[PDB]
Amino acid sequence: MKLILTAEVEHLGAAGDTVEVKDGYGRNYLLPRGLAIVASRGAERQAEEIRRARESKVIRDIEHANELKTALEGLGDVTLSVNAAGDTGKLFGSVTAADVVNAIKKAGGPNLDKRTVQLAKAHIKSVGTHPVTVKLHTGVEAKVSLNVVAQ
Amino acid sequence: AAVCDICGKGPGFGKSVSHSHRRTSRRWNPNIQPVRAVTRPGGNKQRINACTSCIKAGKVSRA
RNA sequence: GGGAGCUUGACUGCGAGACGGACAUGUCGAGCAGGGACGAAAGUCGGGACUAGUGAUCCGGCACCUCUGAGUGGAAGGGG
RNA sequence: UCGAUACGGUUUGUGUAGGAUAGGUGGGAGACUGUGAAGCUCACACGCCAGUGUGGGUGGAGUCGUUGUUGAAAUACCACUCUGAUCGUAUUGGGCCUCUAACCUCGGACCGUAUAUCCGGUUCAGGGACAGUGCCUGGUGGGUAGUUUAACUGGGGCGG
RNA sequence: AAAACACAGGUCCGUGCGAAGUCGCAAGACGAUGUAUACGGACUGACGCCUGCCCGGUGCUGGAAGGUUAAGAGGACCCG
RNA sequence: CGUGUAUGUGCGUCCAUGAUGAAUCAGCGGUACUAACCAUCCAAAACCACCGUGACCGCACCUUUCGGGGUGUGGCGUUG
RNA sequence: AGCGAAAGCGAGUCUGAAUAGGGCGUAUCCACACAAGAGUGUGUGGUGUAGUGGUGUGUUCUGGACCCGAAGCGGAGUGAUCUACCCAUGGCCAGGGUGAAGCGCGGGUAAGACCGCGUGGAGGCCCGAACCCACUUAGGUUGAAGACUGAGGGGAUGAGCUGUGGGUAGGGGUGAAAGGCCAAUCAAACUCCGUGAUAGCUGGUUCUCCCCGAAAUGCAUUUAGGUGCAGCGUCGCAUG
RNA sequence: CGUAGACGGUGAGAGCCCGGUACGUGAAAACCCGACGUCUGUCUUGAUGGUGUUCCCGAGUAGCAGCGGGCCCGUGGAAUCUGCUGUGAAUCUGCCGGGACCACCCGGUAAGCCUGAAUACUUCCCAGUGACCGAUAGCGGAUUAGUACCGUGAGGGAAU
RNA sequence: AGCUGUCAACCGAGCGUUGAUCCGAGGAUGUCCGAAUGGGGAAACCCGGCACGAGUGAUGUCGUGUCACCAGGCGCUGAAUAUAUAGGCGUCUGGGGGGAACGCGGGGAAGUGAAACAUCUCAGUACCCGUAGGAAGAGAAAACAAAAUGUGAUUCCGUGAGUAGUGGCGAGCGAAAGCGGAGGAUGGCUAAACCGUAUGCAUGUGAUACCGGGUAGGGGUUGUGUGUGCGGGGUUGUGG
Ligand SMILES: [Mg+2]
Ligand SMILES: [Mg+2]
Ligand SMILES: [Mg+2]
Ligand SMILES: [Mg+2]
Ligand SMILES: [Mg+2]
Ligand SMILES: [Mg+2]
Ligand SMILES: [Mg+2]
Ligand SMILES: [Mg+2]
Ligand SMILES: [Mg+2]
Ligand SMILES: [Mg+2]
Ligand SMILES: [Mg+2]
Ligand SMILES: [Mg+2]
Ligand SMILES: [Mg+2]
Ligand SMILES: [Mg+2]
Ligand SMILES: [Mg+2]
Ligand SMILES: [Mg+2]
Ligand SMILES: [Mg+2]
Ligand SMILES: [Mg+2]
Ligand SMILES: [Mg+2]
Ligand SMILES: [Mg+2]
Ligand SMILES: [Mg+2]
Ligand SMILES: [Mg+2]
Ligand SMILES: [Mg+2]
Ligand SMILES: [Mg+2]
Ligand SMILES: [Mg+2]
Ligand SMILES: [Mg+2]
Ligand SMILES: [Mg+2]
Ligand SMILES: [Mg+2]
Ligand SMILES: [Mg+2]
Ligand SMILES: [Mg+2]
Ligand SMILES: [Mg+2]
Ligand SMILES: [Mg+2]
Ligand SMILES: [Mg+2]
Ligand SMILES: [Mg+2]
Ligand SMILES: [Mg+2]
Ligand SMILES: [Mg+2]
Ligand SMILES: [Mg+2]
Ligand SMILES: [Mg+2]
Ligand SMILES: [Mg+2]
Ligand SMILES: [Mg+2]
Ligand SMILES: [Mg+2]
Ligand SMILES: [Mg+2]
Ligand SMILES: [Mg+2]
Ligand SMILES: [Mg+2]
Ligand SMILES: [Mg+2]
Ligand SMILES: [Mg+2]
Ligand SMILES: [Mg+2]
Ligand SMILES: [Mg+2]
Ligand SMILES: [Mg+2]
Ligand SMILES: [Mg+2]
Ligand SMILES: [Mg+2]
Ligand SMILES: [Mg+2]
Ligand SMILES: [Mg+2]
Ligand SMILES: [Mg+2]
Ligand SMILES: [Mg+2]
Ligand SMILES: [Mg+2]
Ligand SMILES: [Mg+2]
Ligand SMILES: [Mg+2]
Ligand SMILES: [Mg+2]
Ligand SMILES: [Mg+2]
Ligand SMILES: [Mg+2]
Ligand SMILES: [Mg+2]
Ligand SMILES: [Mg+2]
Ligand SMILES: [Mg+2]
Ligand SMILES: [Mg+2]
Ligand SMILES: [Mg+2]
Ligand SMILES: [Mg+2]
Ligand SMILES: [Mg+2]
Ligand SMILES: [Mg+2]
Ligand SMILES: [Mg+2]
Ligand SMILES: [Mg+2]
Ligand SMILES: [Mg+2]
Ligand SMILES: [Mg+2]
Ligand SMILES: [Mg+2]
Ligand SMILES: [Mg+2]
Ligand SMILES: [Mg+2]
Ligand SMILES: [Mg+2]
Ligand SMILES: [Mg+2]
Ligand SMILES: [Mg+2]
Ligand SMILES: [Mg+2]
Ligand SMILES: [Mg+2]
Ligand SMILES: [Mg+2]
Ligand SMILES: [Mg+2]
Ligand SMILES: [Mg+2]
Ligand SMILES: [Mg+2]
Ligand SMILES: [Mg+2]
Ligand SMILES: [Mg+2]
Ligand SMILES: [Mg+2]
Ligand SMILES: [Mg+2]
Ligand SMILES: [Mg+2]
Ligand SMILES: [Mg+2]
Ligand SMILES: [Mg+2]
Ligand SMILES: [Mg+2]
Ligand SMILES: [Mg+2]
Ligand SMILES: [Mg+2]
Ligand SMILES: [Mg+2]
Ligand SMILES: [Zn+2]
């Protein structure tokens, strides 16, 4: 099928480019790896590829870089915005990993991936401050205290 | 290996006919292949049988 | 039966009346017309003195014809 | 690596009436020098080696025409071009050595899992677009299956 | 009830390993918790002396320069 | 084999009694899974020399002088 | 209303170049003419044309089709309590002979070989009961018995016999192999179903009287003991 | 007597002897029916026919091919429908069908879904009927009847 | 007004106007096996867990509940391994089996006939498998038809018609259109395009942004893009 590249592929084309190829890539190499995408709507797919080029090229990390980023996120309270009435302080939805990666970009600033934020074990959905762990490598780990304000 | 795990496409039954018009019963079997696909974006892989029509139509994500 | 001349009747449309016959086959046939051969003409000529030298139907090929042609015009296919 | 396509630039035509190794042309009074051509130095091009187009090294400031014979003129120029020795691009096959990512492993480990030589998963190590399997296709095929294998006849058979 | 089968001994062929062979549509199983001094198949049949010729036929195994040959690619040419 | 009751020795939870094996402060000597390092098995890309060409030809050249064919060296070139 | 393969035409139509013959068709009969006696035709008049629907009988077609009868074929199931082989776990094998290796002693040997003697207890060893077979013969042969009995006979520590539990299933199993065995059955078990299988073959088919009354030949036949058509019977109608 | 002369029984052919028949009457409860209300939903911040373009009209589908199935149609010139495999479009001056195919005309609007009635049958219950059988008949079974019995078992299967 | 079912009576006892026997309706009890379901099992017989009572001097013993497996909702946890998933725990709600025929969708013979037989037939039959319902299936034109200003969803019945056809053109098989009827509902609803919304995934220009507009002010439906759900809106052939 015809895809749109998000990264560079040797002897294929440039990133952000709409390229026709056999279905082997669009089934076995490119689509699983994310260095391309199904080309659905022209503006849509172009924006998606170019935008993902921006996030992927910034969520990269190295081991000493990971230690530096842990030092960067060893900051203070990270405030979050999710609906919850003060009647019982009970959050109806599940505070998604995007809601915390964006939350720490708003509070402290450093960017990161929703893959690395251990959402399932936070015991979300109580109002107050709660701890969430984030891991980049085999050893490095960062603890983030995340809270919410009243609604 | 003649039922698709996705669309349930099973074999069909017909006759093989010789030059002397000597018909015998046989099966047209589906082209089901052992696929090992992901249900999640993350990439945990579970082995199923999928006909090549389902592979072509992208009903299974072999990510 | 032997010899020579010319020549294609080793025809087309038909056929009164018959022989033989379980049936299917088969066999003879004068005479009419077209267009010819030979003969001056009369006339004879629908292969061979005669009786063997053959294979039903089905299915298909081919050439010709003024037939048919699945809404209509063609075509394919069928038909004679 | 070879082949088929479309596209670009060198490059080609023994003839006798001759200043003619006369590609088929439309325009042809006027195109080619010192961004160093003429004539010399070689190769590229062929050579029926009869002779001619390109470069710089030299070179000095021209060659050319309905010139006339020549069917057809420039072989002075733009745009179309078969014959050919050619490279490259776009596209697609045939093959080859590969890579890993599909797929495969009754190779290891670990987990579901107290119990487990099942099974599934995760992961390392190996193969690998092969194999296996669908569909289409040619072979081999008493391994099996269904069946056929005449009659007359001084019984039937054998002969006929 | 035998001279027939089996047999210990002989050879030949296959099998490099969830082997080959067999039972199954498959998965799976036996082979074998074996690994070529092992396992399956074929013939011969303790022991002793030996086992001739023929490779044309038919199988088996091996090989490839050619001839022939499917599906699949090709669509010149022809027809409506 | 269980079960209840009453009594007897009688170790014990607490005290207390022993056994007790340590660690930190800091002085250190190797024992270290962690570069770089060494030896080992194999060939990354690779030349030389001997000897042949898978086919073409220039061949020592032979056979009824030349029918066919071919023992053998060489260059283009490698089943190498 | 028919002729034609059909388009079509229509008491006509087809063939054909043909008012030129023939095919099929124009209910049937009567007369009068006009043409030939090559079997009569043609035409004018007349007469005018008989089907259909119930139902009885005979025959026939499709159905099990007048009734009875195979060996066998297919589908789905049941069976290894008999027997064949295997798997687990047990039991049995009176009595008596023989006398293997091994060990020990001596002799003999350069050293061996080996022998003689002992202990020793081998073996699909020997004789022989229980047990397992089944070679001969006699009896039985509407038996005591759907395979026995009597007298002898082979094996009898082994490829032995045996109990209990289990596994293999029909084109399949199992077989030291006889086409053996797989529930008194096996060249493909049995049960039910297809199913009332099919049989050019055999058998059977039931009251009466009246009239008539054959054939056993020809031709063809995957035909020859079957059938079709002819011949030959009967009934009805026509003719005489 | 009769709106009752259906049919049985009673000591032999009974309308007036019995049960009944013709004809009427009856349901507390349960169940099946309707009907009227609560209830439920929708429609009305709103109607109508005009005038001129862009988008939309069921996609791994149609169509095409290979091998089959089924159509009266046994592969035939073989349409329509349909399975497996491969390839694989358009959104209306589209696409499908009208027996190969093409052109023109006509009919329709696939790849989304629901749907009553007219139709088939009888384990069981009620009420009847027979130019049906009448104990070797009729169900295998009028009586111990799927019983006794036969078979390891599927199963076979009486007589009275 | 008599009763204690019956074969099938005899004895022994009783009940009944204070309404029995009897009949109809609704209930209660309802051992064990059986889908059989706490576990096991050779069906109808063996062995339990837990909870609440009973009973004993205590164990023993008794009674009533409850305890299978799967599938789907919801809640908790999230192995290898981080995201997480597979899984695990709990609480609900269903499933399972039977049944004579009729329905639908699949698989699919052979005897037989063809005077042999293989195409063909038998026959899509017998049988098997999956599933129902009181009926099912089908059903609202991508249909017929033929130049008629024609029919109009489906199903079923009669014809057409043993016809056109088809067929080792063999034995055989065999329509539909049209036409006459039973019934009526020529019945309904979505998708898409656009508009609004909510949420998810990549994003901010983090700034003059969107809003039907003009005015003024603030300054984010994140500006945006996309996918999903919900609601409007649409539902067609003379095209809508
Ligand atoms: Mg499966
Ligand atoms: Mg079929
Ligand atoms: Mg058949
Ligand atoms: Mg593909
Ligand atoms: Mg003469
Ligand atoms: Mg002739
Ligand atoms: Mg005649
Ligand atoms: Mg003449
Ligand atoms: Mg004549
Ligand atoms: Mg024939
Ligand atoms: Mg047509
Ligand atoms: Mg036409
Ligand atoms: Mg023709
Ligand atoms: Mg492959
Ligand atoms: Mg293949
Ligand atoms: Mg064979
Ligand atoms: Mg055979
Ligand atoms: Mg047969
Ligand atoms: Mg014979
Ligand atoms: Mg004979
Ligand atoms: Mg004789
Ligand atoms: Mg004789
Ligand atoms: Mg013996
Ligand atoms: Mg004997
Ligand atoms: Mg023998
Ligand atoms: Mg041997
Ligand atoms: Mg041999
Ligand atoms: Mg094998
Ligand atoms: Mg060997
Ligand atoms: Mg022998
Ligand atoms: Mg020997
Ligand atoms: Mg020999
Ligand atoms: Mg030999
Ligand atoms: Mg030989
Ligand atoms: Mg040989
Ligand atoms: Mg040889
Ligand atoms: Mg060979
Ligand atoms: Mg092709
Ligand atoms: Mg006619
Ligand atoms: Mg003629
Ligand atoms: Mg005439
Ligand atoms: Mg009459
Ligand atoms: Mg009659
Ligand atoms: Mg049978
Ligand atoms: Mg059994
Ligand atoms: Mg001894
Ligand atoms: Mg001794
Ligand atoms: Mg012995
Ligand atoms: Mg002996
Ligand atoms: Mg003895
Ligand atoms: Mg003795
Ligand atoms: Mg004895
Ligand atoms: Mg014996
Ligand atoms: Mg004897
Ligand atoms: Mg006697
Ligand atoms: Mg006696
Ligand atoms: Mg005896
Ligand atoms: Mg005896
Ligand atoms: Mg034993
Ligand atoms: Mg057993
Ligand atoms: Mg056997
Ligand atoms: Mg029996
Ligand atoms: Mg027997
Ligand atoms: Mg059998
Ligand atoms: Mg048989
Ligand atoms: Mg039958
Ligand atoms: Mg019979
Ligand atoms: Mg008489
Ligand atoms: Mg006769
Ligand atoms: Mg007669
Ligand atoms: Mg009476
Ligand atoms: Mg549509
Ligand atoms: Mg067909
Ligand atoms: Mg067809
Ligand atoms: Mg429906
Ligand atoms: Mg009876
Ligand atoms: Mg009697
Ligand atoms: Mg009876
Ligand atoms: Mg019994
Ligand atoms: Mg009562
Ligand atoms: Mg009751
Ligand atoms: Mg139980
Ligand atoms: Mg149980
Ligand atoms: Mg659950
Ligand atoms: Mg986790
Ligand atoms: Mg059920
Ligand atoms: Mg048959
Ligand atoms: Mg037959
Ligand atoms: Mg017969
Ligand atoms: Mg009804
Ligand atoms: Mg319905
Ligand atoms: Mg009909
Ligand atoms: Mg048929
Ligand atoms: Mg909507
Ligand atoms: Mg809506
Ligand atoms: Mg219209
Ligand atoms: Zn599928």
Show me where the domains of chain A are located: 2-58, 63-144
d(CA A35, CA A139) in angstroms, rounded, equals: 28
3-state per-residue secondary structure call for chain A: CEEEECCCECCCECCCCEEECCCCHHHHHHHHHCCEEECCCHHHHHHHHHHHHHHHCCCCCCHHHHHHHHHHCCCCCEEECCCCCCCCCECCCCCCHHHHHHHHHHHCCCCCCHHHECCHHHCCCECCCEEEEEECCCCCEEEEEEEECCC
Q: Which residue is nearest to nucleotide I200 (CA to C1')?
A: A96
Closest-CA residue to B30 (of B44, B56, B49, B43): B49
Q: What is the resolution of this structure in A?
A: 3.0
Of B43, B56, B62, the CB nearest to A28: B62
> Can you name the CATH fold of A63-144?
Ribosomal Protein L9; domain 2 (3.10.430)
Q: Could you tell me the CA-to-CA distances from B32 to A1, A93, B7, B47 in Å, in that order? A: 21, 41, 11, 13
The rounded Å distance from CA B24 to ligand 88 centre is 21
CATH class, domain A2-58, is alpha beta
Q: Which nucleotide is nearest to B11 (CA to C1')?
A: H84
Q: What angle do CA A128, A132, A137 make, to 5 degrees?
A: 170
Is strand I within 7 Å of residue B18 (CB)?
A: no
Question: How far does CA B3 lie from the centroid of its chain?
Answer: 6
Q: Which two tokens stand for residue A65?
A: 């870089």
Q: Which nucleotide is nearest to B2 (CA to C1')?
A: D134
Which residue out of A27, A29, A119 would a mutagenesis test of the B interface target, given it has the greatest number of B Cβ atoms within 10 Å?
A27
d(CA A61, CA A52) in angstroms, rounded, equals: 16
- The spacing between the Cα labelled CA in A56 and the C1' in D56, in angstroms, equals 57
Are A98 and A117 within 8 A, CB to CB? no
The rounded Å distance from CA B13 to ligand 25 centre is 50
* Strand D footprint nucleotides (protein C-beta < 7 Å): 101-104, 120-122, 129, 132-136
* Method used to solve the structure: cryo-EM
